[PDB]
């Protein structure tokens, strides 16, 4: 017998898709807003991760984010296209988040960015702990939840006349974790 | 044998603080080196055992709870310090005795809960000051849940001590300062939260006091505050 | 330059892997962490915390304090166990909901020693003796006090010590118990003698039960299941 | 270019049922995203016997497990059916055996 | 040759990275640099330069020298502050336009000590005493001289030293102040005594105000916003 | 105290110093100096009030 | 505190 498989890491450290960002190629025809998709990194959707985290009160963790992109033509038409390339923007906490497809924010130097060309090795980056305080909290007993930035994705090839929808799974995986003050776990049910 | 603990103008008698539990076995202390760190240090009269109004545990009592520092948002000095000061951080020795006669069977669990977010929302709602808040068995967060839809049976993770009447009749949790920061606004954020629930239901003999009292004696320890002191130069 | 050959396995994302990834804020300095008290380093250090066992899961009594006490009474002195309890930390609803169990839920094999506790919490003047017996696995839970006294068992005097503790031992052929369905043993409590009392003191005591892991306990092969 | 998901399900773990059953997402299961037309994917589960060695024969009552593979395409609304085979090429490594037995005739299998 | 495996992250351009790139003029020799005086090595070494604070942002007075002086007068001796000033280096228009503020604009967290200055620039013969008070954050800016004298405050004699300097201290629970919206403290100036003067000398002095960072100041997590 | 051997409780005894006003609520008194004397533990709370006076001899 | 991020 050994404890290894249940150390904090071995427990928390596990790739878990936390969401699927979906965007559409800027088909100048009728594409409304699917032009770009944006998601505020929060565990609060994946019961799985969420639960393991609420087992404690405080924690720090360099979060690593992988990116898996998947496309397909919407029309069975002779859908042709050149290998597209996606932009992956990480927006650190307390930074403006893009609004337009072509909002200045994509260009803005602060935001670390990723250009993943479709059909290649999945993209990957790893923001370090970014709490303004000394550890992300999971509970609070005061007044005016923490941030971990925003992801933003948009296709870059422009006037394509063939709609090309694309999902982008994000596979966040806590690394170098450390927790504080264990708490009883919430029943699977309420989520 | 009875020890008589003193903190200036206040004194508490205690049978035997042998069963004293320090949460996470970390004794509370000040901010270590790790003046420039603005450690205004008034460890004088704000560090005296205060005594909250006693609650009356009965047959159908569900449970009680107090947020800290909140509780002491009035206990004279300390309560003051939480206003003339923007920042602070105190540990606390909570000392819960509940004198009862040898003819009262019963048992309470005292649970210190870091960041005790009691669910089911409006400041005043979650800050019952010095009289504490009570639970309910169905506003009043659900007892066997502690607001948060948890199964009671797991509470024991949180620094706890059981006042089983047919044994010790007192309990003393010692919380050290705990938080995601190193110091903080003592007013709008309750580091801890003490909940007292009856595990074994209070029962007694025919004609006997049918409502034993339980007092809380919260003494802030090694507390400190931010600074107003600026600096000049010629 | 340096000639290389990409072997199979290149360009596949393998959730279960870890490789130095390029950082997105290389200039950014992280906030140094403080010595927050109560850092946990291993899940076991939660399984090690004695928590309460919901002995009664009767729709009525459950989902309220009532699911944790045992109505030690003074009614017709029957001869069955006061509360039998199978030690399948996972295969039994009673033990399933405990903290221990909660961590066990995230693993397939675990194998250690459970330690139980029975804190009596009745009158200070009340007194009696209960027999707590460990029926080892394979066998059948004892149904008479007699049979149980033949087995291993403490004779715990209410009057002398308000709490009988007792570490059940670790066993398994397959030297890692499987959480799923089917043995594990049992733990029963027998009225040894009635709980005699002085004056009007009620004839309704209660007993609390704890459970936790000992240092020998450990788990392996993680398996989350929580979904919706 | 499609991309396949390759899920390894370690022994005594739930196996996916739906196309979109939660199991694909479930953190326990090591996973593989192989993008079509690339270097063949590869992983290597270590010995996973609950006992001290896989058995090949038994003389008792209530065969061992080595997990489950699960594959599903991830590109969704493609309007062109694209069937795909996935050969698995398992190759025992670091082997060690016990108690040799006479071999069974080619015939019975 | 050497067998390799390209892990995920290959062939992605990551703005936030840096790797030795092949040079396009490997033969080209660069012009050696000279010891130009005034090399800056860190942005802070600009935040460290006391600059003027536009005390008046009244459409009229702004966008001209007038937005920087305070008309110390000798009109009805009211009891409010001469010029209150919230120390939100970023959350306040007055302080926002300063150099300090300009560098702060390119960051999210910064946390140090601001040092202010008030250079009086009225008659050589003029004389009086003004009370400058630091209302610490959380509280409310003082509205009477009395309240302000109870707080921290210099009693700066015009006549003796033409300039009151004074480093306000660093504070914050969240040990990095956020530039956006909401506390920070205040700095007020009270007429302590009227500014008495000899002959026809005008009853219209003025005072200039400076601000800058001290060595303890620093910033982290860059964030440019400038656009169009 | 000279009540039952089995009786038990806690009384707060408080010294309101001169000049002030005697406390009328338990709360106010706990803020002042005061022993919390447990009936059940010690049958008698003793306590020396201190000497004070500007006029360093109190007038009867 | 450190200056690093603003060099």
mmCIF file of N, CA and C in Angstrom, chain B residues 2-76:
data_model
loop_
_atom_site.group_PDB
_atom_site.id
_atom_site.type_symbol
_atom_site.label_atom_id
_atom_site.label_comp_id
_atom_site.label_asym_id
_atom_site.label_seq_id
_atom_site.Cartn_x
_atom_site.Cartn_y
_atom_site.Cartn_z
ATOM 1 N N UNK B 2 -10.238 24.412 39.352
ATOM 2 C CA UNK B 2 -10.814 25.389 38.439
ATOM 3 C C UNK B 2 -9.802 26.502 38.184
ATOM 4 N N UNK B 3 -9.454 26.711 36.904
ATOM 5 C CA UNK B 3 -8.508 27.753 36.537
ATOM 6 C C UNK B 3 -9.300 29.031 36.331
ATOM 7 N N UNK B 4 -8.702 30.167 36.710
ATOM 8 C CA UNK B 4 -9.380 31.446 36.574
ATOM 9 C C UNK B 4 -8.561 32.336 35.650
ATOM 10 N N UNK B 5 -8.953 32.339 34.379
ATOM 11 C CA UNK B 5 -8.246 33.035 33.320
ATOM 12 C C UNK B 5 -8.612 34.509 33.354
ATOM 13 N N UNK B 6 -7.609 35.368 33.112
ATOM 14 C CA UNK B 6 -7.801 36.813 33.162
ATOM 15 C C UNK B 6 -7.291 37.529 31.906
ATOM 16 N N UNK B 7 -8.008 38.574 31.512
ATOM 17 C CA UNK B 7 -7.630 39.413 30.394
ATOM 18 C C UNK B 7 -8.103 40.804 30.770
ATOM 19 N N UNK B 8 -7.302 41.410 31.645
ATOM 20 C CA UNK B 8 -7.605 42.730 32.151
ATOM 21 C C UNK B 8 -8.935 42.710 32.893
ATOM 22 N N UNK B 9 -9.795 43.645 32.524
ATOM 23 C CA UNK B 9 -11.061 43.810 33.195
ATOM 24 C C UNK B 9 -11.981 42.583 33.109
ATOM 25 N N UNK B 10 -11.573 41.487 32.462
ATOM 26 C CA UNK B 10 -12.499 40.362 32.419
ATOM 27 C C UNK B 10 -11.863 39.086 32.960
ATOM 28 N N UNK B 11 -12.679 38.249 33.601
ATOM 29 C CA UNK B 11 -12.181 36.992 34.134
ATOM 30 C C UNK B 11 -13.225 35.884 33.993
ATOM 31 N N UNK B 12 -12.730 34.728 33.564
ATOM 32 C CA UNK B 12 -13.566 33.573 33.322
ATOM 33 C C UNK B 12 -13.065 32.411 34.154
ATOM 34 N N UNK B 13 -13.980 31.712 34.827
ATOM 35 C CA UNK B 13 -13.497 30.509 35.484
ATOM 36 C C UNK B 13 -13.701 29.341 34.521
ATOM 37 N N UNK B 14 -12.728 28.432 34.502
ATOM 38 C CA UNK B 14 -12.793 27.272 33.632
ATOM 39 C C UNK B 14 -12.396 26.018 34.404
ATOM 40 N N UNK B 15 -13.240 24.983 34.295
ATOM 41 C CA UNK B 15 -12.976 23.735 34.987
ATOM 42 C C UNK B 15 -11.575 23.288 34.598
ATOM 43 N N UNK B 16 -11.430 22.734 33.386
ATOM 44 C CA UNK B 16 -10.156 22.252 32.867
ATOM 45 C C UNK B 16 -10.093 22.329 31.346
ATOM 46 N N UNK B 17 -9.319 23.308 30.877
ATOM 47 C CA UNK B 17 -9.126 23.511 29.455
ATOM 48 C C UNK B 17 -8.156 22.452 28.935
ATOM 49 N N UNK B 18 -8.446 21.191 29.268
ATOM 50 C CA UNK B 18 -7.622 20.069 28.852
ATOM 51 C C UNK B 18 -8.028 19.645 27.443
ATOM 52 N N UNK B 19 -9.321 19.815 27.174
ATOM 53 C CA UNK B 19 -9.934 19.457 25.910
ATOM 54 C C UNK B 19 -10.016 20.675 24.991
ATOM 55 N N UNK B 20 -8.960 21.502 24.987
ATOM 56 C CA UNK B 20 -8.908 22.663 24.109
ATOM 57 C C UNK B 20 -8.394 22.242 22.727
ATOM 58 N N UNK B 21 -9.074 22.706 21.682
ATOM 59 C CA UNK B 21 -8.676 22.316 20.343
ATOM 60 C C UNK B 21 -8.342 23.559 19.537
ATOM 61 N N UNK B 22 -7.135 23.571 18.969
ATOM 62 C CA UNK B 22 -6.744 24.667 18.100
ATOM 63 C C UNK B 22 -6.963 24.180 16.680
ATOM 64 N N UNK B 23 -7.834 24.885 15.956
ATOM 65 C CA UNK B 23 -8.232 24.547 14.595
ATOM 66 C C UNK B 23 -7.016 24.386 13.681
ATOM 67 N N UNK B 24 -6.913 23.216 13.046
ATOM 68 C CA UNK B 24 -5.761 23.023 12.171
ATOM 69 C C UNK B 24 -4.446 23.090 12.943
ATOM 70 N N UNK B 25 -4.505 22.820 14.244
ATOM 71 C CA UNK B 25 -3.315 22.807 15.071
ATOM 72 C C UNK B 25 -2.374 23.963 14.771
ATOM 73 N N UNK B 26 -2.946 25.104 14.393
ATOM 74 C CA UNK B 26 -2.113 26.263 14.155
ATOM 75 C C UNK B 26 -2.514 27.234 15.239
ATOM 76 N N UNK B 27 -1.566 27.595 16.099
ATOM 77 C CA UNK B 27 -1.922 28.555 17.124
ATOM 78 C C UNK B 27 -2.059 29.915 16.441
ATOM 79 N N UNK B 28 -2.984 30.844 16.797
ATOM 80 C CA UNK B 28 -3.014 32.146 16.140
ATOM 81 C C UNK B 28 -1.823 32.961 16.648
ATOM 82 N N UNK B 29 -1.201 33.748 15.748
ATOM 83 C CA UNK B 29 -0.095 34.635 16.095
ATOM 84 C C UNK B 29 -0.225 35.880 15.230
ATOM 85 N N UNK B 30 0.707 36.834 15.352
ATOM 86 C CA UNK B 30 0.568 38.039 14.547
ATOM 87 C C UNK B 30 1.042 37.827 13.115
ATOM 88 N N UNK B 31 1.301 38.935 12.418
ATOM 89 C CA UNK B 31 1.912 38.800 11.110
ATOM 90 C C UNK B 31 3.420 38.715 11.326
ATOM 91 N N UNK B 32 4.018 37.637 10.826
ATOM 92 C CA UNK B 32 5.453 37.505 10.958
ATOM 93 C C UNK B 32 6.075 38.485 9.963
ATOM 94 N N UNK B 33 7.378 38.733 10.112
ATOM 95 C CA UNK B 33 8.131 39.649 9.267
ATOM 96 C C UNK B 33 7.822 39.440 7.782
ATOM 97 N N UNK B 34 7.554 38.188 7.386
ATOM 98 C CA UNK B 34 7.242 37.865 6.001
ATOM 99 C C UNK B 34 5.736 38.013 5.737
ATOM 100 N N UNK B 35 6.801 47.493 10.950
ATOM 101 C CA UNK B 35 6.578 48.916 10.664
ATOM 102 C C UNK B 35 6.285 49.145 9.183
ATOM 103 N N UNK B 36 7.156 48.622 8.310
ATOM 104 C CA UNK B 36 6.992 48.760 6.869
ATOM 105 C C UNK B 36 5.754 47.967 6.447
ATOM 106 N N UNK B 37 5.448 46.921 7.225
ATOM 107 C CA UNK B 37 4.305 46.054 6.997
ATOM 108 C C UNK B 37 3.087 46.554 7.779
ATOM 109 N N UNK B 38 3.134 47.841 8.173
ATOM 110 C CA UNK B 38 2.110 48.595 8.896
ATOM 111 C C UNK B 38 1.362 47.750 9.929
ATOM 112 N N UNK B 39 2.066 47.168 10.928
ATOM 113 C CA UNK B 39 1.413 46.345 11.939
ATOM 114 C C UNK B 39 1.005 47.142 13.176
ATOM 115 N N UNK B 40 0.038 48.059 13.011
ATOM 116 C CA UNK B 40 -0.455 48.809 14.158
ATOM 117 C C UNK B 40 -0.856 47.754 15.185
ATOM 118 N N UNK B 41 -0.226 47.805 16.362
ATOM 119 C CA UNK B 41 -0.431 46.742 17.327
ATOM 120 C C UNK B 41 -1.120 47.179 18.620
ATOM 121 N N UNK B 42 -2.471 47.135 18.700
ATOM 122 C CA UNK B 42 -3.180 47.438 19.938
ATOM 123 C C UNK B 42 -3.674 46.145 20.592
ATOM 124 N N UNK B 43 -2.731 45.368 21.144
ATOM 125 C CA UNK B 43 -3.029 44.129 21.851
ATOM 126 C C UNK B 43 -3.083 44.477 23.333
ATOM 127 N N UNK B 44 -4.101 45.258 23.697
ATOM 128 C CA UNK B 44 -4.205 45.736 25.062
ATOM 129 C C UNK B 44 -5.552 45.389 25.691
ATOM 130 N N UNK B 45 -6.589 46.155 25.334
ATOM 131 C CA UNK B 45 -7.891 45.942 25.937
ATOM 132 C C UNK B 45 -8.875 45.317 24.958
ATOM 133 N N UNK B 46 -8.487 45.194 23.686
ATOM 134 C CA UNK B 46 -9.408 44.561 22.758
ATOM 135 C C UNK B 46 -9.304 43.041 22.914
ATOM 136 N N UNK B 47 -8.286 42.593 23.666
ATOM 137 C CA UNK B 47 -8.019 41.183 23.919
ATOM 138 C C UNK B 47 -8.485 40.740 25.313
ATOM 139 N N UNK B 48 -9.793 40.855 25.557
ATOM 140 C CA UNK B 48 -10.388 40.467 26.825
ATOM 141 C C UNK B 48 -11.588 39.566 26.523
ATOM 142 N N UNK B 49 -11.784 38.496 27.311
ATOM 143 C CA UNK B 49 -12.923 37.616 27.122
ATOM 144 C C UNK B 49 -14.232 38.397 27.136
ATOM 145 N N UNK B 50 -14.980 38.364 26.033
ATOM 146 C CA UNK B 50 -16.286 38.995 26.022
ATOM 147 C C UNK B 50 -17.299 37.897 26.220
ATOM 148 N N UNK B 51 -18.523 38.255 26.602
ATOM 149 C CA UNK B 51 -19.479 37.177 26.793
ATOM 150 C C UNK B 51 -20.790 37.477 26.087
ATOM 151 N N UNK B 52 -21.150 36.617 25.131
ATOM 152 C CA UNK B 52 -22.363 36.861 24.375
ATOM 153 C C UNK B 52 -23.534 36.474 25.262
ATOM 154 N N UNK B 53 -24.703 37.050 24.960
ATOM 155 C CA UNK B 53 -25.918 36.715 25.676
ATOM 156 C C UNK B 53 -26.122 35.220 25.465
ATOM 157 N N UNK B 54 -26.330 34.512 26.569
ATOM 158 C CA UNK B 54 -26.539 33.076 26.585
ATOM 159 C C UNK B 54 -27.811 32.646 25.854
ATOM 160 N N UNK B 55 -27.743 31.505 25.168
ATOM 161 C CA UNK B 55 -28.947 31.010 24.522
ATOM 162 C C UNK B 55 -29.496 29.926 25.425
ATOM 163 N N UNK B 56 -30.777 29.623 25.249
ATOM 164 C CA UNK B 56 -31.382 28.607 26.086
ATOM 165 C C UNK B 56 -31.677 27.362 25.268
ATOM 166 N N UNK B 57 -30.812 26.367 25.411
ATOM 167 C CA UNK B 57 -31.001 25.113 24.710
ATOM 168 C C UNK B 57 -32.201 24.369 25.259
ATOM 169 N N UNK B 58 -33.086 23.865 24.406
ATOM 170 C CA UNK B 58 -34.254 23.219 24.991
ATOM 171 C C UNK B 58 -34.435 21.853 24.341
ATOM 172 N N UNK B 59 -35.631 21.253 24.482
ATOM 173 C CA UNK B 59 -35.836 19.982 23.804
ATOM 174 C C UNK B 59 -35.755 20.204 22.299
ATOM 175 N N UNK B 60 -36.699 20.987 21.784
ATOM 176 C CA UNK B 60 -36.810 21.259 20.363
ATOM 177 C C UNK B 60 -35.891 22.382 19.860
ATOM 178 N N UNK B 61 -34.752 22.642 20.515
ATOM 179 C CA UNK B 61 -33.813 23.639 20.007
ATOM 180 C C UNK B 61 -33.139 23.026 18.784
ATOM 181 N N UNK B 62 -33.068 23.743 17.668
ATOM 182 C CA UNK B 62 -32.431 23.123 16.518
ATOM 183 C C UNK B 62 -30.919 23.313 16.624
ATOM 184 N N UNK B 63 -30.481 24.579 16.706
ATOM 185 C CA UNK B 63 -29.084 24.969 16.803
ATOM 186 C C UNK B 63 -28.873 26.495 16.706
ATOM 187 N N UNK B 64 -27.647 26.938 17.014
ATOM 188 C CA UNK B 64 -27.286 28.345 16.972
ATOM 189 C C UNK B 64 -26.032 28.521 16.143
ATOM 190 N N UNK B 65 -25.739 29.788 15.792
ATOM 191 C CA UNK B 65 -24.547 30.161 15.023
ATOM 192 C C UNK B 65 -24.253 31.662 15.116
ATOM 193 N N UNK B 66 -22.956 31.986 15.089
ATOM 194 C CA UNK B 66 -22.421 33.331 15.198
ATOM 195 C C UNK B 66 -21.301 33.496 14.196
ATOM 196 N N UNK B 67 -21.251 34.642 13.518
ATOM 197 C CA UNK B 67 -20.104 34.823 12.646
ATOM 198 C C UNK B 67 -19.070 35.597 13.450
ATOM 199 N N UNK B 68 -17.790 35.384 13.176
ATOM 200 C CA UNK B 68 -16.740 36.144 13.841
ATOM 201 C C UNK B 68 -15.938 36.748 12.723
ATOM 202 N N UNK B 69 -15.423 37.998 12.819
ATOM 203 C CA UNK B 69 -15.533 38.845 13.992
ATOM 204 C C UNK B 69 -16.938 39.309 14.271
ATOM 205 N N UNK B 70 -17.805 39.447 13.245
ATOM 206 C CA UNK B 70 -19.176 39.943 13.404
ATOM 207 C C UNK B 70 -19.645 40.041 14.860
ATOM 208 N N UNK B 71 -19.850 38.888 15.515
ATOM 209 C CA UNK B 71 -20.311 38.804 16.895
ATOM 210 C C UNK B 71 -19.860 40.022 17.705
ATOM 211 N N UNK B 72 -18.552 40.237 17.729
ATOM 212 C CA UNK B 72 -18.003 41.335 18.472
ATOM 213 C C UNK B 72 -18.122 42.656 17.717
ATOM 214 N N UNK B 73 -19.160 42.879 16.895
ATOM 215 C CA UNK B 73 -19.245 44.169 16.221
ATOM 216 C C UNK B 73 -19.814 45.203 17.197
ATOM 217 N N UNK B 74 -19.736 44.915 18.496
ATOM 218 C CA UNK B 74 -20.308 45.809 19.486
ATOM 219 C C UNK B 74 -19.587 45.643 20.822
ATOM 220 N N UNK B 75 -19.038 44.446 21.069
ATOM 221 C CA UNK B 75 -18.309 44.209 22.305
ATOM 222 C C UNK B 75 -17.259 45.292 22.502
ATOM 223 N N UNK B 76 -17.742 46.444 22.965
ATOM 224 C CA UNK B 76 -16.889 47.565 23.285
ATOM 225 C C UNK B 76 -15.691 47.742 22.369
#
